[PDB]
Curated annotation (Swiss-Prot):
Highest taxon of source: Bacteria
Active site per UniProt: 10
Annotated phenotype, changing residue 1094 to A: Dramatically reduced target DNA binding, slightly decreased target cleavage
Stated consequence of mutating residue 823 to A: Only cleaves 1 DNA strand, probably the noncomplementary strand
Pfam families linked to this entry: Cas9-BH, Cas9_PI, Cas9_REC, Cas9_RuvC, HNH_4
Positions contributing to Mn(2+) 2 binding: 10, 823
Species assigned in the record: Streptococcus pyogenes serotype M1
Protein name, UniProt field: CRISPR-associated endonuclease Cas9/Csn1
Applications reported: Coexpression of Cas9 with an artificial single guide RNA (sgRNA) which fuses the crRNA with the tracrRNA in human cells has shown it is possible to target and modify DNA sequences of interest. Cas9 plus the 2 sgRNAs have also been expressed individually in human and mouse cells to achieve DNA targeting; cleavage efficiencies of the artificial sgRNA were lower that those for systems with the 2 sgRNAs expressed separately. Microinjection of Cas9-encoding mRNA and a synthetic sgRNA into zebrafish embryos induces targeted mutations.
GO MF terms held by the record: 3'-5' exonuclease activity; DNA binding; DNA endonuclease activity; metal ion binding; RNA binding
DNA sequence: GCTATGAGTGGCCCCTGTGGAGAGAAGCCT
DNA sequence: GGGGCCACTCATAGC
RNA sequence: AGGCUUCUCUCCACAGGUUUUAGAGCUAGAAAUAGCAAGUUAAAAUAAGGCUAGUCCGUUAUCAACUUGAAAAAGUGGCACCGAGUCGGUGCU
């Protein structure tokens, strides 16, 4: 017969539960055939088990490294551009110069030219390293000198600047010329007093210079200034200007009594023209003061980093670094003298041992700055004359390096200034530099805009750029090849979610005029009013709706029901008393866009004509899409013909954010077949029907729901990957979803394809309903006689606290730490409870004590980075992997620790010994991930390359990670890699022991009635003998399968060493002890006070004579292979 | 007599620090 | 967290 | 409707780190070694490379075994009963 049955499911972060139950709450056991070459020709198993797999990983690392790769490629491109520019002139001075630079990383033997990269003779190298100890001295030389310079040195300077061109946080142009804060602040005071001599603010008594110098919050510095500034406050004009210079965004209308509201941020780029915007209102006199404020802002911003170079030069950064170097040398000499004078013994320790964290480790070792300061500080405290050094160390300025993490704040404008100064000074002697100043400067300043995206030629799945001319994109001609305009549209449109009712349609901007119309009219649909004499509330008439909208909504930005009752019914309809329902004291909808556009354009008839609707909608869309004004101006240029220049300029300034939820072709695109009206038209006037959006979509009287039904055609059957990709949540749970789907498919395959009646599901931490919907779509595919689905399979969602309280009430405790059966038991209880809401407890106990549970470790082909990235120094081994195809690791060192893609069993002959004699062998060979393509290209070739001979192709068995092997006495192992094995057996602890362990674990944390607590305490106290039984069972299981004789002896000694402790402590230490036999990699643990190192099974020989297992996703189908009989010696 | 093998056994090692722009969600508050 | 690698020590097989 | 925080996806940039090489160590001493001197920077790579040859792409996800397929994809293993330490036995077919 067709046994009525249902399948329970448990979906988690790392595992999937599966179980089959009858209506009688039993668990049937069935017999399954075995394929392969074994003799165990039939196996019977319970229809319950749990699946395991690794956690899915977010894409974040992949995205990071993709972006990094692109940055590196573009940096190399910039160097190549500079070298192409220099090439022809460089050919005359030194032909091999760029060759020397390229091959500089090879050893003396490998190089094709002279070994000194720069000059090719050692004498000039020493001269260069004497005259310029660091590159910054050369940069200063080229900044200041009027003498003709060697072309090679200038190339070095320019390349150094380009390859580290710094950040682009600041827009505009910073002026390092305004080096000193104090005099600029005095100029600000003078200009402020000239503007306001009636109420001067005293400069004396204000410590602006130091406070601006002192490292404090911008709000903190502003507060300190207000305390110092007499008769002044933050929102006051002078304090507002100071905050503007600091970086706060103050509004300026209150100071000048302006209708316009302008919150300017000086650093922000829009400030540069919005300043002229505001000065157009407030007159020209206020302009120069804002200029001085900008100067003060630049002064403080740069002085925070340049460390106040009083030396009058155009390139502060080089001077600052050179000053730091000089102070470093001075302090080094002084420290050497003092330490040699007072503590002769530690000289070698501090200054020779690379392993220490002293100066030797700080320079020739790997010690950072902080560790060196930490080591050196106490020594200074034991000596004399260390006052200055300790003060400097409190500044973090002792013996400082030059290439450190501080430079992460240097703005690129400084590098640009030095570049320009060089190109100006040296142009007189070198003509070709003069022609290329623009190009070189652009190379530094240019970058691909964030919204354009990668410059790909179609064949890149991440690209959206549109290319006009087939010229190669180069920074000099970027503008003429790609369109910034058309590009940006595509960049934005990738994300705007499609309309639900019309999946092929894009949603409109939230601030669309059509959107405002829709919201206003629809909210008016369900408004009812009661006047005297009216027995029932009346729907507002379409004529009334139109008149009210025209009179109030197009005249008032925010309208209350009070205004309606006072203005329309009262004044026009002569109803003094009206009772209105459906709106709470004000309309939620508002025609804000209408008022703004009428404010700017000032043509009401233009806004009132439907013939202009497309124009307005396009305008709103454009004003929402972009954020750079220039492209908006480009797009608005289409409508400059109907509008004057000032109106056009005002439009280019408003901005909107947010998107709507409905599509144009929905609200005003689809028409009713009967009348030709749109949803908007029906809302505006629908007779006595006065239907809302919900009514208009769910009513069959109009063809709208027909079109929507026609619109939601089921998409073409996608691969499971894209079904996974659409959902919302952590991708691991999506992995679990796919696993559960395949589990259901395979289980239906098992039961003779007779579909189950019910499905009970639970989920770990909406998407649950999505999983249920996917399952129901897969299962129920019968449409009834009326094209309605027949629900032969019901899917019910249940919550975890249900089963939790079900366990706690009937005392079927779970302990996650004893084994992995708990997933299967939770799934089975899920199914049973779900069926229950649609012998029993004896059956529950009988099932839960079953030792046979189907646990399968899902095999995985490891993918990811080829190996570790921390490049290691050279050393004599064959276990390092070259960084390039031609860089022998012995000479150059390189990578280490590859990750094995998988392993294949090898049966061949090998030349062994000094005599090169053939021995027939059979072992595991691991394919590295980096070699996967080569091996799957032609395995025979790759194997022959490894030295194996007479390769027998058919013998190759493909063994992923967590391949499973069978050994004597049921001992099992999982293949972690080619050389390490993990435990493959489970400790089956009977039910009563588990319950006792739970009770003892919470012995002082049990929660229940006090009578229940006393019952459970007494039950624990009665069965104290359980301690030794559990200990001995662990011992016996270890002796059979784990083989941890040293560890087992240590554990047994520890248990005897502490046998006299209370129950709860002993139980907690028991919980720790289960780690020894858990499935997976061995893990160390603490038992009372003794640490047990993890035992690693570091040999894989014993499986070469074992029986291999291949399991279905639940293992109900098995194909066992005996490896002993193939390739016998 | 000597060398080579591998088989443990213990112990150590693993790239990091940011900023900007955008879209969606989700959770909290008003 | 868990696998790769090294230093050490050493029984063991081989010769 | 609005404000703040957190999460996912994509793009743009920055600063380091590492590696090797270059930056003539000197003296005494056959050497071991001892003494002294100096110590802050630079070039290149930053998953091997691939072909569609782009200022593109390479660490996400998907894959037990057998037959049919380039792959997506398709097909491939009996039933009931009594028992239970990784599952056993009995009967029909």
């Amino acid at each position: 017969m067709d046994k009525k049955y249902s399948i329970g499911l448990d979906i988690g972060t790392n595992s999937v539960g599966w179980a089959v139950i009858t209506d009688e709450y039993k668990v049937p056991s069935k017999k399954f055939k075995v394929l392969g070459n074994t003799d165990r020709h039939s196996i019977k198993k319970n229809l319950i088990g749990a699946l395991l797999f690794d956690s899915g990983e977010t894409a974040e690392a992949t995205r990071l490294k993709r972006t990094a790769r692109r940055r590196y490629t573009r940096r190399k491109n910039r160097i190549c551009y500079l070298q192409e520019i220099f090439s022809n002139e460089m050919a005359k001075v030194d032909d091999s110069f760029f060759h020397r630079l390229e091959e500089s990383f090879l050893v003396e033997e490998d190089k094709k030219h002279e070994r000194h990269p720069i000059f090719g003779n050692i004498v000039d190298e020493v001269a260069y390293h004497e005259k310029y100890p660091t590159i910054y001295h050369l940069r200063k030389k080229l900044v200041d000198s009027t003498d003709k310079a060697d072309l090679r040195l200038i190339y070095l300077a320019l390349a150094h600047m380009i390859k580290f061109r710094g950040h682009f946080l600041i827009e505009g142009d910073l002026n390092p010329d305004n080096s000193d804060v104090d005099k600029l602040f005095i100029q600000l005071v003078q200009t402020y007093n000239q503007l306001f001599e009636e109420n001067p603010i005293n400069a004396s008594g204000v410590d602006a210079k130091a406070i601006l110098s002192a490292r404090l919050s911008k709000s903190r510095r502003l507060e300190n200034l207000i305390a110092q500034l007499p008769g002044e406050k933050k929102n006051g004009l002078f304090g507002n200007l100071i905050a503007l210079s600091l970086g706060l965004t103050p509004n300026f209308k209150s100071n000048f009594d302006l209708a316009e509201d302008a919150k300017l941020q000086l650093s922000k780029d829009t400030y540069d023209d919005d300043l002229d915007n505001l000065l157009a209102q407030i007159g020209d006199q206020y302009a120069d003061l804002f200029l001085a404020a900008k100067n003060l802002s630049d002064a403080i911003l740069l002085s925070d980093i340049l460390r106040v170079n009083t030396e009058i030069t155009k390139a502060p950064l080089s001077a600052s670094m050179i000053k730091r170097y000089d102070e470093h040398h001075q302090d080094l000499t002084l420290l050497k003298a003092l330490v040699r004078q007072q503590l002769p013994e530690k000289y070698k320790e501090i200054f020779f041992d690379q392993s220490k964290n002293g100066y030797a480790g700080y320079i020739d070792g790997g010690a950072s700055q902080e560790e060196f300061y930490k080591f050196i500080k106490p020594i200074l405290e034991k000596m004399d004359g260390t006052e200055e050094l300790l003060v400097k160390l409190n500044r973090e300025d002792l013996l400082r390096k030059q290439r450190t993490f501080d430079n992460g704040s240097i703005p690129h404008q400084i590098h640009l200034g030095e570049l320009h100064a060089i190109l100006r000074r040296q142009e007189d002697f070198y003509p070709f530099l003069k022609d290329n100043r623009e190009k070189i400067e652009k190379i530094l300043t240019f970058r691909i805009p964030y919204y354009v995206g990668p410059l790909a030629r179609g064949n890149s799945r991440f690209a959206w750029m549109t290319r006009k001319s087939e010229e190669t994109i180069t920074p000099w001609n970027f503008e003429e090849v790609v369109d910034k305009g058309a590009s940006a549209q595509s960049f934005i449109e990738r994300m705007t979610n499609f309309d639900k009712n019309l999946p092929n349609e894009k949603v409109l901007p939230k601030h669309s005029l059509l959107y405002e119309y829709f919201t206003v009219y629809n909210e008016l649909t369900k408004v009812k009013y009661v006047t005297e004499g009216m027995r029932k509330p009346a729907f507002l008439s379409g004529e009334q709706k139109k008149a009210i909208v025209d009179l109030l909504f197009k005249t008032n930005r925010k309208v209350t029901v009070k205004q309606l009752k006072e203005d329309y019914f009262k004044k026009i309809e002569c109803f003094d008393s009206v009772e209105i329902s459906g709106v709470e004291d004000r309309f939620n909808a508002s025609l804000g866009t209408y008022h703004d556009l009428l404010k700017i354009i000032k043509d009401k008839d233009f806004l009132d004509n439907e013939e202009n609707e497309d124009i307005l909608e396009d305008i709103v869309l454009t004003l929402t899409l972009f954020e750079d004004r220039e492209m908006i101006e480009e797009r608005l240029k289409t409508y400059a013909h109907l509008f004057d220049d000032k109106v056009m300029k005002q439009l280019k300034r408003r901005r909107y954010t947010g998107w709507g939820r409905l599509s144009r072709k929905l609200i005003n695109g689809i028409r009713d077949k009967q009348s030709g009206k749109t949803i908007l038209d029906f809302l505006k006037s629908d007779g006595f029907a006065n239907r809302n959006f919900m009514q208009l979509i769910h009513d069959d009287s109009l063809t709208f729901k027909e079109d929507i039904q026609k619109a939601q055609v089921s998409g073409q059957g996608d691969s499971l990957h894209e079904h996974i990709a659409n959902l919302a949540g952590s991708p691991a749970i999506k992995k679990g979803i796919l696993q559960t789907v395949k589990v259901v498919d395979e289980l239906v395959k098992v039961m003779g394809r007779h579909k189950p009646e019910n499905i009970v599901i639970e989920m770990a931490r909406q998407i649950t309903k999505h999983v249920a919907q996917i399952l129901d779509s897969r299962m129920n595919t019968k449409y009834d006689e009326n094209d309605k689905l027949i629900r032969e399979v019901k899917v019910i969602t249940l919550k975890s606290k249900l089963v939790s309280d079900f366990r706690k009430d009937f005392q079927f405790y779970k302990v996650r730490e004893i084994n992995n059966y708990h997933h299967a038991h939770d799934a089975y209880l899920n199914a049973v409870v779900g069926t229950a809401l649609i012998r029993d407890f004896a059956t529950v106990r009988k099932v839960l004590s079953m030792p046979q549970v189907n646990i399968v470790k899902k095999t995985e082909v490891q993918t990811g980075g080829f190996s570790k990235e921390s490049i290691l120094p050279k050393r004599n081994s064959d276990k390092l992997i070259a960084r390039k195809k031609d860089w022998d690791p012995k000479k150059y060192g390189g990578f280490d620790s590859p990750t094995v893609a998988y392993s294949v069993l090898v049966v061949a002959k090998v030349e062994k010994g000094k005599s090169k004699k053939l021995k027939s062998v059979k072992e595991l060979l691991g394919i590295t991930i980096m070699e996967r393509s080569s091996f799957e290209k032609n395995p025979i070739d790759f194997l022959e390359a490894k030295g194996y001979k007479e390769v027998k192709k058919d013998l190759i068995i493909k063994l992923p990670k967590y391949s499973l092997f069978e050994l004597e006495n049921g001992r099992k192992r999982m293949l972690a890699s080619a050389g390490e094995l993990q435990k493959g057996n489970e400790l089956a602890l009977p039910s009563k022991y588990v319950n006792f362990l739970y009770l003892a674990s919470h012995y002082e944390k049990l929660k229940g009635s006090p009578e229940d607590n006393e019952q459970k305490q007494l039950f624990v106290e009665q069965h104290k003998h359980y301690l030794d039984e559990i200990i001995e069972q662990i011992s016996e299981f270890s002796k059979r399968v784990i083989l941890a004789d040293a560890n087992l002896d240590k554990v047994l000694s520890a248990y005897n060493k502490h046998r006299d402790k209370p129950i709860r402590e002993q139980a907690e230490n028991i919980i720790h002890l289960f780690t020894l036999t858990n499935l997976g990699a061995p893990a160390a643990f603490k038992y009372f006070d003794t640490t047990i190192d993890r035992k690693r099974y570091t040999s894989t020989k014993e499986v070469l004579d074992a029986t291999l297992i291949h399991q279905s996703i639940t293992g109900l189908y098995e194909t066992r292979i005996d490896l002993s009989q193939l390739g016998g010696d």
